[PDB]
Amino acid sequence: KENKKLLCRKCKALACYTADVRVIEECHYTVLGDAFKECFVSRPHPKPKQFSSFEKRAKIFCARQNCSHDWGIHVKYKTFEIPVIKIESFVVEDIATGVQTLYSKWKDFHFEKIPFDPAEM
DNA sequence: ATCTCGGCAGGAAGCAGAAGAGAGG
Ligand SMILES: [Zn+2]
Numbered sequence: 001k002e003n004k005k006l007l008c009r010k011c012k013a014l015a016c017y018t019a020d021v022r023v024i025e026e027c028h029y030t031v032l033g034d035a036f037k038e039c040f041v042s043r044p045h046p047k048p049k050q051f052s053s054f055e056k057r058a059k060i061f062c063a064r065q066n067c068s069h070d071w072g073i074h075v076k077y078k079t080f081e082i083p084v085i086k087i088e089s090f091v092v093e094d095i096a097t098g099v100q101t102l103y104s105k106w107k108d109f110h111f112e113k114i115p116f117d118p119a120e121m
Numbered sequence: 122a123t124c125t126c127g128g129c130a131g132g133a134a135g136c137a138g139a140a141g142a143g144a145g146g
Contacts, residue, residue: 027133051140088135104135 004111006090008062009102010069015039015062015090022116025052029106030082032120039063040083042074053077054084080121 006015016031016039023029042058049056058074060083061067072085087109091100103109 025139027139102135106133 001095002111003095005093005095006085007093007100008064008067008069008071009089009091011062011064011067012091012100013039013062013064013067015071015085018092018111021085021111021114022120023113024077024082024084024116027106028054028084029087030084030116036083040071041068045073057081060085078118080118082116 002018004018006018006021007013008015016033016036020032020036021029022032039062040060041063042060045056045058047056054075054077056073056075060071060074062069062071069089070086071089072083074081074083087103087106091102092109093100101109
């Protein structure tokens with residue numbers, strides 16, 4: 001498998017696998033499934049606002065109370081409410097070796113980037 | 122008709138550079 005783990009960059013908690021990640025409109029990344037909702041907590045967005053196809057409701061954070069690292073935002077997209085994750089918020093871990101890589105640009109991070117399909121909901 | 126602008130710093134996004142829709146500062 002080319003499947004990789006994303007860990008919290010601050011505490012190294014498991015956030016999700018690249019197999020769960022989907023791309024919206026070429027440059028915003030979300031995570032599928034109910035597992036990911038156990039990994040983050042929301043706070044209301046201090047400056048909630050529309051941009052492009054998104055209405056920002058919340059910021060999301062590592063669910064660990066001693067960590068609380070910023071992970072991205074929670075948005076309304078179409079009829080859905082979805083997380084949008086920052087690449088800077090995570091380290092990418094090779095599952096076989098446990099070696100960790102830091103990215104600040106999604107374009108530097110080479111993995112199978114599957115477009116978001118509403119039918120997967 | 123270009124070029125310009127060090128770890129947070131003029132009104133999408135980490136050694137040299139996406140979103141109320143550039144100006145000579
Ligand atoms: Zn964390």
